[PDB]
C-alpha cells in the first residue's frame, strides 16, 4: 500500500527475503500485515517498454488464472505471493517436492488455457501473451494456476515458433505453440531441452513414426501412468499446438474444450 510498507516488510531488503532476479526485476518476499507479497524491483528503453507492457495488461484485464497486480509505485510492481512456486519448479521437483499427480497437472493446464482464451478475446483489442512457459505459470496454495509475465504482450527462444523467429510474425497461434510445449513438459516432466535436443523435436519425431500410443513410454516416471486415452489425447493436443504451420494449430478455445474432456476421462 505504501513504499514504507515494503522496506519494513523485507527488513529493508535483507537477503532472508530475496526470492530471485531476472532481466528486468529484483524480486523480494514482502510480509505486509497478514498477507505475503512478491515485489519486483524495476532495475535501457527496451526494459522500460516491457515494464509498461506489463502494467498495461494487468491494470486493464483481470481473470482468476492471471496473477493480479495489487499495487505499483512510480519503481516496482507488487503481486500476491504464490507459495507453490512455478510450474517448472514443481515439474522438476525443486526442493524435493513430491511430483504433481495427474489431476493437478490437468487442472493447471485448464486454468492457464482459460486465462489465455480470455486474453485472446478481451473486448477492445485482443492480447497476445508472448511469454507463455512453465516458468511463467505460478501456483497458489491449492495449485490454482496464475499466468504471469506480459512484458512481451501485444494487441491484435525455445517456446517461440519458426514464423516468429524467422519472419517476426506474431498471432493468437503464437501462444498456442508455446502452450503446446508446456503440455509436453507437463506430460513428460522433461525440460524443453534434454541432456542436446529439444523436447518438441523428440516428441514430434516419435509421434510421426510410432503413433500416439508410443509416447506412453515418455510419461513422467515419477507417477504411475495415467489412463491410456488421457495420455493419447494430451500428446495429440500438444503435437497439434506445437505444429510448425500455424494453420495446423488449434485455437485456444478448442484447446480448452479438449483439455476439459481429457480431465473428465480421468474421473
Ligand atoms: N508472485 C510471485 N510469487 C512468488 N515468486 C515470484 C512471484 N513473482 C516472481 N517470483 C519469482 O521471483 C523470481 C524472479 O522473477 P523473474 O520472473 O525471473 O523476474 P523478471 O525480471 O520479471 O523476469 P524476466 O522474464 O527474466 S524479465 C523467480 O524465481 C519467480 O518465480
38: DSSP letter: E
Q: Is 163 exposed, middle or buried (0-12, 13-18, 19+ CB in 10 A)?
A: middle
How far, in Å, CA of 187 to CA of 124, rounded?
35
Residue labelled with grid coordinates 507459495: 83
- Cα 157 to middle of ligand 1, angstroms: 18
Question: With b meaning 16 or more CB within 10 Å and e meaning fewer, what string describes 108-130?
Answer: bbbbbbbbbbbbbeeeeeebbbb
Short-list 20, 19, 116, CA closest to 66: 116
Q: Which residue has the CA at smallest separation from atom 30 of ligand 1?
A: 20
Query: Is residue 24 in contact with ligand 1, taking CB distance under 6 Å?
Result: yes
Short-list 215, 221, 251, CA closest to 233: 215
- Cα 7 to middle of ligand 1, angstroms: 19
**Whole-number CA gyration radius for the chain:** 19
251: DSSP letter: P
Residue labelled with grid coordinates 508472448: 130
How far, in Å, CA of 15 to CA of 198, rounded?
36
How far, in Å, CA of 83 to CA of 102, rounded?
20
Atom of ligand 1 minimally distant from the CA of 24: 21
- The residues with which 154 forms a beta bridge, in sequence order, are 128
Q: Are 199 and 193 in contact (CB under 8 A)?
A: yes
Backbone angles phi, psi at 36, to 5 degrees: -115, 135
Experimental method: X-ray
Long-range Cβ pairs for the range 192-201 (8 Å, 24+)? 192/134, 192/158, 192/159, 193/158, 198/158, 200/242
How far, in Å, CA of 257 to CA of 263, rounded?
10
Please check if 134 is assigned to a binding site: yes
- The residues with which 146 forms a beta bridge, in sequence order, are 138
Could you give the domains of the chain? 3-80 (3.30.200.20), 85-266 (1.10.510.10)
How far, in Å, CA of 152 to CA of 49, rounded?
9
Resolution of the determined structure in angstroms stands at: 2.2
Short-list 72, 2, 81, 88, CA closest to 34: 81
Q: Are 246 and 173 in contact (CB under 8 A)?
A: yes
- Cα 22 to middle of ligand 1, angstroms: 7
- Cα 25 to middle of ligand 1, angstroms: 8
3-state secondary structure the chain: CCHHHHHHHCCCCCHHHEEEECCCEEEEEEEECCEEEEEEEECCHHHHHHHHHHHHHHHHCCCCCECCCCEEECCEEEEECCCCCEHHHHHCCHHHCCCCCHHHHHHHHHHHHHHHHHHCCCCCCCEECCCCCCCCEEECCCCCEEECCCCCCEECCCCCCHHHHHHCCCCHHHHHHHHHHHHHHHHHCCCCECCCCEHHHHHHHHHHHHCHHHHHHHCCCCCCCCCHHHHHHHHHHHHHHCCCCHHHCCCHHHHHHHHHHHHHHCC
Amino acid at each position: 500500500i505504501s513504499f514504507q510498507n515494503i522496506i519494513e516488510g523485507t527488513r529493508n531488503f535483507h537477503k532472508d527475503f530475496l526470492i530471485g532476479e531476472g532481466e528486468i526485476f529484483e524480486v523480494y518476499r514482502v510480509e505486509i500485515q497478514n498477507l505475503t507479497y512478491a515485489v519486483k524491483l524495476f532495475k535501457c528503453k527496451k526494459h522500460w517498454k516491457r515494464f509498461l507492457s506489463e502494467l498495461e495488461v494487468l491494470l486493464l484485464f483481470h481473470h482468476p488464472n492471471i496473477l493480479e497486480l495489487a499495487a505499483y509505485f512510480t519503481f516496482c510492481l507488487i503481486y500476491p505471493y504464490m507459495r507453490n512456486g512455478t510450474l517448472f519448479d514443481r515439474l522438476q521437483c525443486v526442493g524435493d517436492t513430491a511430483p504433481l499427480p495427474w489431476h493437478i497437472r490437468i487442472g493447471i493446464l485448464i486454468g492457464i488455457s482459460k486465462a489465455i482464451h480470455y486474453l485472446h478475446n478481451v473486448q477492445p483489442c485482443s492480447v497476445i501473451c508472448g511469454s507463455i512457459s512453465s516458468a511463467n505459470i505460478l501456483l497458489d496454495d491449492q495449485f490454482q494456476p496464475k499466468l504471469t509475465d506480459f512484458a512481451m504482450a501485444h494487441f491484435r527462444l525455445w517456446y517461440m515458433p519458426e514464423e516468429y523467429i524467422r519472419q517476426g510474425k506474431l498471432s493468437i497461434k503464437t501462444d498456442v505453440y508455446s502452450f503446446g510445449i508446456v503440455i509436453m513438459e507437463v506430460l513428460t516432466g522433461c525440460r524443453v531441452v534434454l541432456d542436446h535436443i529439444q523436447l518438441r523435436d523428440l516428441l514430434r519425431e516419435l509421434m510421426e513414426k510410432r503413433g500416439l500410443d508410443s509416447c506412453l513410454s515418455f510419461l513422467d516416471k515419477k507417477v504411475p501412468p495415467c489412463p491410456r486415452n488421457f495420455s493419447a489425447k494430451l500428446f495429440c493436443l500438444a503435437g497439434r499446438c506445437a505444429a510448425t504451420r500455424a494453420k495446423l494449430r488449434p485455437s485456444m478455445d478448442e484447446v480448452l474444450n479438449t483439455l476439459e474432456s481429457t480431465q473428465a476421462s480421468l474421473y
